[PDB]
Amino acid sequence: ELHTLRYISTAMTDPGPGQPWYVDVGYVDGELFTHYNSTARRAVPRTEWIAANTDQQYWDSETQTSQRTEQIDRDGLGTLQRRYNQTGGSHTVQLMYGCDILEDGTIRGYSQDAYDGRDFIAFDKDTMTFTAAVPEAVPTKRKWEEGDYAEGLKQYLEETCVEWLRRYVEYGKAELGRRERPEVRVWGKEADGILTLSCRAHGFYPRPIAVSWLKDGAVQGQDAQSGGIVPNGDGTYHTWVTIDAQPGDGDKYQCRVEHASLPQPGLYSW
Amino acid sequence: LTPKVQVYSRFPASAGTKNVLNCFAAGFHPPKISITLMKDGVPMEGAQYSDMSFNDDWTFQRLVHADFTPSSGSTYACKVEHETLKEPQVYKWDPE
Amino acid sequence: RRREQTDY
Amino acid sequence: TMEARFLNRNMKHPQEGQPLELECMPFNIDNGVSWIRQDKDGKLHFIVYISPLSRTAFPRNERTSSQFEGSKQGSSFRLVVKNFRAQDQGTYFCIANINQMLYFSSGQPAFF
Amino acid sequence: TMEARFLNRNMKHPQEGQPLELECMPFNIDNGVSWIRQDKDGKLHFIVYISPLSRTAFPRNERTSSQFEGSKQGSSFRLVVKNFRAQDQGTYFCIANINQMLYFSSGQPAFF
């Protein structure tokens, strides 16, 4: 039901060991499907359903767009660096935009930019305006509210974005609607009289998962500690959840895993 | 803020079965980061770095992974270097 | 498809 | 940083006998949230918990309500009072329990 | 059910610059609780979580507080404001998360 198209981009004065300074990437339903960077200079496919359904003119046009935006943000880094009266150092421009078709069937679109990791300027589609988060964004707002660029952005986020999302979702219907069952391992360690149970779910897809601990049949809302959902290197996901207990109550805990690839929730023990 | 680091295998480890070791760092800033997979203090080879990405709060993330065959009596870890840390931090992997 | 941007 | 609001940004007060949609965008959506209503007196009422799989749980342990609808929509959590009446007046909060810590969204007043 | 309170019920107001001990009677004492404070504004603040192992969890994933103490003793839960200031005024509530459902104590006002 839910489908998402999202493009994000980062320009940095200090990209770090091994890194290009400009990188923009796209995701469909959470899945990285296209990539561009300032070293390769070319927008390239990243899945097999986008490559199988795209010509070269698509990729050359995406590359031209990405080069235009690469120097747009090259200029923007210097512009903001001395707009803040800064004489070098570590600075970052980030942008993220896209559209969502939600589970009730309505559409939403968004676009927002950050300087140095904090909200810089956001798009209020409805007002066709640009809300400034900092004084230094009152300038950019004006530059972005002249001409019809705002209306073009609205029309992109409401029409172009959503139909390209629909087409991408059709291209990869088999791959994105796939389901991978996680394997759950329950482990245990005793430290200083406290027994700590770990529950690890390896290699599940899609990303939405609900892992809970249960003590004598009841979910331990406030006692579980989790590392969140972390990615595997292959399009699958991982998560671990720990809980503390007294040794001797160790066999009353059950790890319950709720995931789309399970018709019934998985119950696992130590 | 400082990176939050997790070290985990792609499959539950069993000595002799091939697997992938992953070190994931999230929630940090600036994007500059150094992440290295090590076995017995030596950098592992065939290691790869995911592209630079961030989440909804603008905080950045990187995944580093390497194919490997786990061996007990050999320790696997991940070395992280970031501006917000005075010194490198090393995260041990638990084979479980 | 990516969208076009303007200068900061 | 997290805040609950009317899904309609024009709405200023609920209306008697009719549905009211509230909404809350958590900073992290790998976790469910809980909707609660606070009276003006201050008593807090649990309404529903919505899991990251758009799984909803009301008082008793039920998943079915005459009186509320919960759902996950994109990167948001949604509460619907199917027929808003006087008892449903109050300030509506959204609550995320992540890593044994509790996070509270901004309250949304809902009075006739 | 649950009540978060003054451990001295003769006490009617906290005292400036001195520790203030609140206490909490759960319906079930096999579960931890969470202490919260509600402001004058109405804003809610997470203070501490106390596990059935008398282990607490402070904001941004800690167990170190130079201004609060949590623990559970006998059949009750304890919150201690080490040095109660005007900064700490508000209504103190207790929260139990059982089976993904939230239970709220009645609440204790704490104002000078």
Residue numbers in the entry:
A (entry chain A): 4 to 273
B (entry chain B): 5 to 100
C (entry chain C): 1 to 8
D (entry chain G), E (entry chain H): 8 to 119
Can you provide the manuscript's text about this entry?
Critical molecules involved in immune defense can be subject to an evolving molecular arms race with all kinds of pathogens, of which the most famous has led to the multiple loci, high allelic polymorphism and high sequence diversity of major histocompatibility complex (MHC) genes. These genes encode the classical class I and class II (aka MHC-I/II) molecules that bind antigenic peptides and present them for recognition by the T cell receptor (TCR) on T lymphocytes bearing coreceptors CD8 and CD4, respectively. TCR and CD8 cooperatively bind to the peptide-MHC-I complex (aka CD8-pMHC-I), which amplifies the peptide discrimination. The CD8 dimer exists as a glycoprotein on the T cell surface in two isoforms, CD8αα and CD8αβ.
In this paper, we determined amazingly high affinities between chicken CD8αα homodimers and pBF2*1501 compared to mammalian CD8-pMHC-I interactions and derived cocrystals of chicken CD8αα homodimers with pBF2*1501 and pBF2*0401. The current study determined the structures of chicken CD8/pMHC-I complexes for the first time, namely, cCD8αα/pBF2*1501 and cCD8αα/pBF2*0401, which each contain complex A and complex B in an asymmetrical unit. cCD8αα binds to pBF2*1501 and pBF2*0401 in an allele-dependent but peptide-independent manner, as demonstrated by the CD8αα-pMHC-I interaction in previous studies. Remarkably, cCD8αα binds to pBF2*1501 and pBF2*0401 in complex A of cCD8αα/pBF2*1501 and cCD8αα/pBF2*0401 in a novel “face-to-face” mode, which is distinct from the antibody-like binding mode of the known human and mouse CD8/pMHC-I complexes. In cCD8αα/pBF2*1501 complex A, the corresponding residue Gln222 only forms two hydrogen bonds with Asn102 on F strand and Gln105 on CDR3-like loop of the cCD8α1 subunit and forms one hydrogen bond with Asn102 on F strand of the cCD8α2 subunit instead of the conserved C strand that located on the deep of CD8 cavity in humans and mice. Moreover, the “face-to-face” binding mode leads to the loss of most hydrogen bonds and salt bridges between the CD loop of BF2*1501 and BF2*0401 and cCD8αα. However, more water molecules contribute to the interaction between the CD loop of BF2*1501 and BF2*0401 and cCD8αα in complex A. Importantly, the MHC-I α3 CD loop (residues 220-228) has been proven to be key for the CD8αα-pMHC-I interaction.
